[model samples]
Target: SGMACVGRTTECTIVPANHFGPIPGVPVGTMWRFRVQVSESGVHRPHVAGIHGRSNDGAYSLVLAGGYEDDVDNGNYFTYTGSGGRDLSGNKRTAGQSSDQKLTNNNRALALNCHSPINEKGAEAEDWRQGKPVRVVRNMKGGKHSKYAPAEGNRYDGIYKVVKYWPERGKSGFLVWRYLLRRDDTEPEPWTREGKDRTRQLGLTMQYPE
Candidate 1:
């Protein structure tokens, strides 16, 4: 334990919506969290940013913020305000959708989750991994959602989720949206533990935060 790296594997794999539910070889209901980085430059390939979620319907679900930079710069960072009421292609707004709707784009939502399930607040919690799991956010400084983005070190310590996403008719006519993220991380999560351990054992702290 003195001079070795300690990396923790996630409980779930990032995949398409239809591929949802218990991955083989992994336990049922296992969850994971990921800090997403999205840019519209299209330089980095899109991928699944792992996360967990739960709703008032007494159910828990795994979520993936389809990390696409092309959407983030387009105001996808924090605009997602509940279910988007449309399909992935931003077509067909379904009825009976969430009225708490506000923002757009959750494909780039910061993945968060709960350590376990909660019963009092319906089926899951809604705290988001701000100060606990992760310690930083970019939109907190300057960007489209900079106003709502977390400050330098705003951390959340509860269940969050990328509820649901869809394209909707707004001033922009069409845009993707994602939701539902919970707090489900133990320890300082990955980056923190990985960095600290590497630093103390291999003299690598100063280079981590950079």
Candidate 2:
């Protein structure tokens, strides 16, 4: 859980910080035992935040960790909830809704990925696939409600694009921002037979903490 203390195994330099595609050597289905390893790989970088990006730029990646009840995961697409609205006085990574989430930080970053001009009221991509890519990682906790999630670790699924984003009332009844992202990756999905074959071909395995 404290994996960031060790720093990244190697820094990724080929792409700019605002890069929108998959990390060159990391294929779909790459799995790491914890957040730090995923962070180290330069796929998703924040040690605690779910979406990693600069609000002024765009989101680079997001983790589907079963954090929000409003999230929905299909093999090819999913709905994601924005961060914040939690009472973090207890000093936890995630907390229950105690306030409304704002359209700043990672939320604004993700919104910038949509093809449509940013809208405070939310907007949909005129041509969803034309939106920016967001590297998607599926965490084990997501399995509690989604079948497409990895069984034991955090797996880099692939690049997805924001189809739409809007503010809505979450299952918690708190106002939250929601986004619909669609798979736009060229590689086969890890759950499919082709993807399974590709994963085995690359010898990708679950990376564990020492």
62-170, model 2: which lDDT tens digit per residue?
A: 9999988889999799999999998888667778887888899899999999999989999998798888889999999999999999999899999999999999888
Candidate 2 — worst ten consecutive residues by lDDT sum? 1-10
Looking at candidate 1, the ten consecutive residues that score lowest on lDDT are 37-46
Q: Candidate 2's error at 70, in angstroms?
A: 0.9
Residue pair clashes in candidate 2: none
Q: Write the per-residue lDDT of candidate 1 for residues 48-110, one digit (tens) a residue.
A: 222222232221232223222223322222333333433344543233332333332322222
Model 1 alpha-carbon drift over 4 Å, by segment: 1-59, 67-81, 88-185, 193-210
Let me know the TM-score candidate 1 reaches against the reference structure. Answer: 0.25
* Candidate lDDT (C-alpha), each: 0.27, 0.89
The TM-scores, one per candidate, come to 0.25, 0.93
Off by over 4 Å in 2: 1-10
* C-alpha-based local distance difference test score of model 2: 0.89
